């Protein structure tokens, strides 16, 4: 199934697409190896979207989120500036 | 600790009832509660021992071991006073009981339901329509034989029996009341004894049969009189084997814990330790053991 | 010093009353002081409850305490006070350390190999040191002899904190009271998921003291600890649990082999103490930083541990 | 309250009597005040046979007492009540260690008369003390003395099935929590072994009368050799058999409970003393 993996980076969009191709290059061969692209539409592999910037120094200070009984690790980004962008396909 | 409940009567006590209560002062009486004022309706063993139903004394044993215990000190008009019995306190209890069992051995006594007949301890109040019954107090060696006679009439109802019915005491022989059907909890206790016997019939050793064989053929004790020089073939057919030590020791460990289970199963009713029983005053300074 | 004198004047038993039978006029002031003491130790005023505090030193008893030395690793200091501890029988002659078990640590001793699980594994996350703490667990529940090596020592009342070599003080016999010279009353905390009220299972004589029973049993899943509460006697409660153990006699019927004496024995019960039957049990909630579990709270406990009487 | 009981010593002791009393000061002693029947020594005299059952029945009957001081003319002892606690000590020549055992038994000493006694030569009597010992040790020595009696009787009658040395190998020593104790076993204890013997040989007909009382469910679980019996018996001898059966079973079962079972909380191995309350 799909996943919604997040990425923090201090690099440009033009660099983030290539470096995510490099990072996901095991998974491209993985998806090509466990299913075979018989139709045209399954050749695509994911997409990204820039969501906004923050100061690279004091960003992503870790914290914790507690529900009634459990606690999962959560990340916390301060002084955000939301700038949404469109979905650039990664393959 | 002023442990002094006042059991107030609903109606006025008559004079013959006053003499009947004042004749029996210092006898064991069970209470339903331990709170500061109780009522006659709820007092005594009469709520579980009624004239309506079968006398089931095993549930009365269990009620006695459950409920608190008391002795009677004051009976006046319209009221009688009881004194509770707590562990750690020494009480004077007088032997004013109609089945005369003398506590000359000064052993542990036992509180027992009146199996020996309702009519001697059915002490009557016609103020309110209530029938207080006093539980009988007797020593432990007579307690074990009345409990075995209660458990044996239920198994010998199917198959002389005056020896089974009447008690065997060294001074006198009193006849006790025996119901034909024991009840729910007496049959439950005999069923628990039946399942204990059917399980532990195979958890018995095999050298004891060689002992009883060699002792009936070789050296007749006084204690081997019950067989009257007779051995079944079951003794030989569990003596067809060789005797060992490890499985016999393990069988004996589970045997000791099962006979402890049997002991606390038969230990019914509260047990009170006597101390310096006075025969002349007919009272005994006792604490609850 | 003057505070110490004015406080030691308060904690002071009263002098005994005198009767001067020899003189005549002194007997008048003796019986006058007697009726003066009685009338203000009987009538409804504050002088009545004043005489209830002198205690007359059969009414009140100081309790005994069980001083034991454990490792801090087998203990969780975040627990509430009245936790029923289970000391394990140590086979070494001069050991000094004894294996005590809170019911949470007892729960993770139970289930490891086979919410109470969540709270138990959240306070006692490591199972290595505590399964290592006993010498043997699987064979000792296989031979059904684990009961005689578990002895109860009653609830904790004061735990002195320690980085290592932790010391616990528990009331083993008698009235459960706190140990601090400023007085407090220790509420016995027992988790509800192993607790039951037997009168809620039975569905009438008002007792003096309702007891608290622990019945370790040898279940086919593994060890199971149950904190039983009943209105009845010891020889009574073994019969009540004989009626309750209805699938247990079926399991005992299930094992055809009699020579294997493991499966003929089904656990043992122990009377831990006697609490107030009138002031009944309350349900409370002992909290941790992750969750909060329902915990049966008993107040005014008089402890006297009984032996493991075998069902 | 007052609880200090003095035993009326008519005869003044010598110094070795003081030594033999100060050796065993912390132990307990029974009671009936008089000085002749003050202990369990009247059963271990030359007057009666050293029987077990009457000794245990007396010990469960008679109260106990712990002694704190011994003088030359007064035996000061405090009696036992279920109310408060006392400090008791294991000062028995058969030694046993109370390393954290919360249960204590008061059994009659079957380690021999000389192993548990204080012999008073100037006085009229020869007193003993009953064995205070932990309850698993107590049931273990009960097993290993009872089967020693049975397995010794079986080799007196015909040793072609059991062996004295092989039963002495396993029954010569108890082992509990590491402390490996020895059983000095050499008649004594014949009444209890005979009681147990006739009781376990009388249980089959009792169980068959019980399964015929109230069917094949509980009749399956007895074994095929303990199931087959001829059901032809008159009512009189069988009635007497079942009566004496449950009689001696009640005696046996109350015997295998070890009397007034003492309980301890903290045993100091340095001082050999523990707080002890009646249970």
Q: E strands along chain D, which residues?
A: 4-8, 28-30, 64-70, 74-79, 85-89, 103-107, 118-119, 126-127, 131-133, 173-176, 179-182, 262-268, 273-278
Nearest one of C186, C183, C149 to C168, comparing CA atoms = C186
Q: Are C300 and C177 in contact (CB under 8 A)?
A: no
Contact B260 C311 (CB under 8 A): no
d(CA C229, CA D276): 27
d(CA B178, CA B165): 7
| Alpha-carbon dihedral D14, D15, D21, D22, rounded to 10 degrees | 160
Give the Cα-Cα-Cα angle D15, D21, D24 (nearest 5 degrees). Answer: 145
Distance, in Å, from the CA atom of D14 to the CA atom of C146, rounded to the nearest integer, reads 51
Tally Cβ neighbours within 10 Å of residue C1: 5
For the beta carbon of residue A58, count every other beta carbon within 10 angstroms: 10
CB < 8 Å & 24+ apart, contacts of B39-42 = B39/B7, B39/B8, B39/B10, B40/B7, B40/B8, B40/B9, B40/B10, B40/B80, B40/B125, B40/B128, B40/B130, B40/B132, B41/B10, B41/B128, B41/B130
Which residues lie across from D223 on neighbouring strands? none
- Resolution of the experimentally solved model in angstroms: 4.1
CA distance D153 to D156: 5
All residues of chain C having their beta carbon less than 8 Å from the beta carbon of residue D219 are: none
The reply to whether D84 touches chain C by the CB within 8 Å rule is: yes
What is the DSSP annotation of C170-238?
Answer: E--EEE----SSS---PPEEEEGGGEEEHHHHH-----SEEEEEEEEEE-SSSEE--EEEESS-HHHHH
Q: How many C-beta atoms lie closer than 10 Å to residue C222's C-beta?
A: 15
Answer yes or no: are the C-beta atoms of C126 and C64 closer than 8 Å: no
**CA of A86: how far to CAs of A49, A80, C4, in Å?**
6, 19, 81
CA B197 to chain centre: 22
- Alpha carbon distance D191, B215 (integer Å): 13
The answer to whether residues C86 and C150 touch, using CB atoms and an 8 Å cutoff, is yes
Measured between its terminal Cα atoms, the distance across chain B in Å is 20
List, as one string, the DSSP characters of B115-170. Answer: TT-STTS--EETTTTEE--PPEEEEHHHHHHHHHHHHHHTTSS---HHHHHS---S
Decide: helix, strand or coil at residue D73. coil
Yes or no: say if B88 and B287 are a contact pair by the CB < 8 Å rule.
yes
Query: Which 3 state secondary structure label does DSSP give D76?
Result: strand
Nearest to B73, CA basis, from B51, B91, B99, B55: B91
Question: DSSP E strands: which ranges in A1-91?
Answer: 47-48, 52-53, 63-66, 71-74, 81-82, 88-89
CA dist C72 and C161 (Å) reads 8
Structural contact between residues D143 and B253, judged by C-beta atoms closer than 8 angstroms = yes
**C96 Rama class: left (phi>0) / alpha (psi -120 to 50) / beta:** left
Contact D174, D141 (CB under 8 A): yes
Q: What span, in angstroms and rounded, lies between the C-alpha atoms of C252 and C141?
A: 16
Q: Do chains A and B meet with 3 or more Cβ pairs nearer than 8 Å?
A: no
Q: DSSP states of B178-223 as a string?
A: --SS--HHHHHHHHHHHHHHHHHTSS--SHHHHHHHHHHHS---ST
DSSP assignment letter at C16 = P
- Partner D contacted by C73 (CB < 8 A): no
Between β-strands B91-94 and B136-139, what pairing exists: parallel, antiparallel or unpaired?
Answer: unpaired
Contact state of C291 with A71 under an 8 Å Cβ cutoff: no
Q: Contacts of residue B86 in chain C, CB cutoff 8 Å? A: 208
DSSP reduced 3-state for A23: helix
Sort strands C150-160 and B79-84 into parallel, antiparallel or unpaired: unpaired
- Which of D97, D223, D266 shows the shortest C-beta gap to C67? D266
Q: Half-sphere exposure of C159 toward its Cβ, with a 13 Å CA cutoff?
A: 23
| DSSP E strand stretches across D84-141 | 85-89, 103-107, 118-119, 126-127, 131-133
C-alpha span between B161 and C290 (Å, rounded)? 71
Look at residue B53 and give its three-state secondary structure: coil
Distance CA C41, CA C52 (A): 9
Chain D meets chain B (3+ C-beta pairs below 8 A):
yes
- Helices B184-200 and D190-213: crossing angle, nearest 10°? 120
Q: DSSP readout, D187-248?
A: -TTHHHHHHHHHHHHHHHHHHHHHHHH--HHHHHSS-HHHH-------HHHHHHHHHHHHHH
Parallel, antiparallel, or unpaired: how do β-strands B79-84 and C209-218 relate?
A: unpaired
Q: Which of B252, B208, B219, B203 is nearest to D193 (CA)?
A: B208
CA distance C184 to C80: 14
Between chains, do C307 and D223 touch, taking CB under 8 Å as contact?
Answer: no
Q: CA D256, CA B260: separation in Å to the nearest integer?
A: 6
Can you tell me the distance from the alpha carbon of D168 to that of C271, in angstroms, rounded to the nearest whole number? 38
Measured CA to CA, the distance from residue D20 to residue D129 in angstroms comes to 13
C-interface mutation test, from A69, A70, A71, A72, most C Cβ less than 10 A away:
A69
Question: Which of D218, C265, D204, C251 shows the shortest CA–CA distance to B202?
Answer: D204
Q: Is residue C208 a contact partner of residue B65, using CB atoms and an 8 Å limit? A: no
Residue C311 Cα to chain centre, angstroms: 21
d(CA C272, CA C173): 9
> C183-193 as b/e, with b when 16 or more CB fall inside 10 Å?
eeebbbbbbbb
For residue C207, list chain B residues with Cβ-Cβ distance below 8 A: 34, 66-68
CA atoms of C229 and C275, how far apart (whole Å) = 10
Solving technique = cryo-EM
Tell me how far CA of residue B161 lies from CA of B150, B170, B227, D31, D239, in angstroms: 13, 19, 20, 41, 8
- What is the rounded CA–CA span in Å between residue D69 and residue C170? 31
| Beta-bridge mates of residue D79 | D65
Strands (E), chain C: 66-70, 84-88, 150-160, 166-170, 173-175, 188-191, 195-197, 209-218, 223-224, 227-230, 268-276, 282-287, 292-298, 301-304, 309-310
Distance between alpha carbon C213 and the CA centroid of its chain, in Å?
10
Residues 6+ apart with CB under 8 A from B136: B97, B99, B111, B112, B113, B114, B115, B116, B121
Report the candidate in D106, D127, D114 with the shortest Cα–Cα distance to residue D62: D106
CB atoms within 10 A of CB C5: 8
Beta strands, E only, C89-149: none
Preceding residues of all breaks in chain B (C to N beyond 2.5 angstroms)?
159
| Alpha carbon separation from D114 to A26, B156, B215, C44, D91 (Å, rounded) | 88, 49, 30, 65, 14
Q: What is the rounded distance in angstroms from the CA atom of residue C154 to the CA atom of residue D98?
A: 19
Burial degree of B204 (CB within 10 A; 0-12, 13-18, 19+)? middle
The alpha-carbon gap from A68 to the nearest alpha carbon of chain C, in Å, equals: 7
Query: What is the signed CA dihedral for D34, D38, D41, D46, rounded to 10 degrees?
Result: 20
d(CA C31, CA C18): 9
DSSP class of C82: B
Q: Give the contacts of B22 (CB within 8 A, at least 6 positions apart).
A: B75
Judge whether D179 is closer than 8 Å to chain C, CB to CB: yes
In the 8-state DSSP scheme, what is residue C245?
-
């Amino acid at each position: 199934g799909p996943r919604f993996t997040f990425f923090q980076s201090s690099r440009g969009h033009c660099q983030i697409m290539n470096i995510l191709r490099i990072y996901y290059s095991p998974s491209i061969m993985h998806r090509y190896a466990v299913v075979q692209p018989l139709h045209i539409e399954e050749l695509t592999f994911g997409a990204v979207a820039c969501l906004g910037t923050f100061s690279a120094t004091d960003g992503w200070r870790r914290s914790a989120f507690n529900y009634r009984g459990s606690s999962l690790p959560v990340v916390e980004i301060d002084s955000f500036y939301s700038n949404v962008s469109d979905w650039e396909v990664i393959l | 600790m002023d442990l002094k409940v006042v059991v107030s009567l609903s109606s006025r006590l008559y004079t013959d009832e006053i003499a009947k209560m004042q004749q029996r002062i210092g006898c064991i009486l069970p209470l339903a509660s331990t709170h500061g004022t109780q009522n006659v309706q709820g007092l005594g063993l009469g709520q579980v021992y009624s004239l309506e139903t079968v006398p089931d004394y095993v549930s009365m044993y269990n009620y006695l071991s459950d409920c608190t215990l008391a002795v009677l000190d004051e009976v006046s008009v319209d009221s009688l006073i009881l004194t509770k019995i707590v562990p750690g306190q020494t009480y004077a209890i007088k032997n004013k009981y109609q089945p005369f069992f003398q506590w000359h051995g000064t052993g542990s006594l036992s509180v027992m339901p009146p199996v020996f007949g309702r009519e001697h301890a059915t002490v009557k109040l016609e103020s309110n329509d209530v029938d207080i019954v006093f539980p009988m107090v007797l020593p432990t060696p007579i307690a074990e034989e009345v409990l075995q006679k209660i458990l044996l009439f239920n198994v010998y109802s199917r198959v002389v029996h005056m020896h089974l019915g009447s008690v065997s005491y060294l001074g006198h022989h009193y006849e006790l009341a025996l119901p034909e059907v024991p009840g729910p909890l007496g049959l439950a206790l005999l069923d628990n004894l039946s399942l204990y016997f059917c399980i532990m019939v195979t958890l018995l050793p095999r050298a004891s049969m060689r002992l009883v064989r060699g002792l009936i053929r070789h050296e007749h004790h006084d204690l081997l009189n019950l067989f009257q020089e007779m051995v079944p073939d079951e003794i030989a057919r569990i003596d067809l084997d060789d005797l060992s030590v490890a499985d016999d020791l393990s069988r004996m460990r589970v045997m000791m814990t099962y006979l402890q289970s049997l002991a606390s199963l038969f230990n019914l009713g509260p047990r009170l330790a006597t101390a310096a029983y006075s025969q002349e005053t007919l009272t005994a300074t006792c604490w609850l053991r | 010093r003057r505070r110490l004198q004015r406080r030691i004047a308060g904690l002071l038993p009263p002098p005994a009353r005198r009767l001067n039978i020899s003189r005549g006029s002194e007997f008048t002031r003796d019986v006058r002081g007697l009726v003066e003491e009685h009338a203000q130790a009987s009538s409804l005023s504050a002088a009545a409850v004043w005489r209830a505090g002198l205690l007359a030193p059969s009414g009140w008893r100081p309790p005994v305490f069980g001083d034991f030395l454990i490792h801090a690793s087998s203990f969780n200091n975040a627990e509430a006070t009245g936790t029923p501890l289970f000391q394990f029988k140590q086979s070494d002659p001069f050991s000094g350390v004894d294996a005590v078990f809170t019911p949470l640590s007892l729960f993770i001793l139970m289930n490891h190999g086979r919410g109470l699980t969540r709270m138990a594994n959240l306070l006692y996350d490591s199972p290595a040191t505590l399964a290592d703490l006993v010498p043997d667990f699987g064979r000792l529940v296989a031979d059904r002899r684990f009961h005689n090596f578990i002895t109860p020592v009653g609830p904790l009342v004061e735990n002195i904190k320690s980085t290592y070599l932790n010391k616990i003080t528990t009331v083993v016999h008698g009235p459960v009271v706190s140990k601090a010279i400023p007085r407090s009353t220790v509420k016995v905390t027992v988790p509800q998921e192993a607790f039951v009220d037997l009168d809620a299972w039975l569905s009438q004589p008002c007792p003096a003291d309702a007891r608290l029973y622990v019945a370790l049993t040898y279940e086919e899943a593994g060890p199971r600890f149950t904190f039983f509460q009943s209105s009845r006697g010891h020889c009574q409660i073994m019969n009540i649990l004989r009626i309750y153990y209805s699938p247990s006699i079926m399991h005992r019927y299930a094992v055809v082999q009699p020579l294997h004496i493991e499966e003929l024995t089904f656990g043992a019960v122990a009377c831990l103490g006697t609490f107030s039957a009138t002031d009944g049990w309350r349900r409370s909630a002992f909290n941790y930083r992750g969750s909060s579990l329902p915990v049966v709270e008993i107040d005014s406990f008089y402890s006297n541990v009984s032996d493991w009487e075998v069902i």
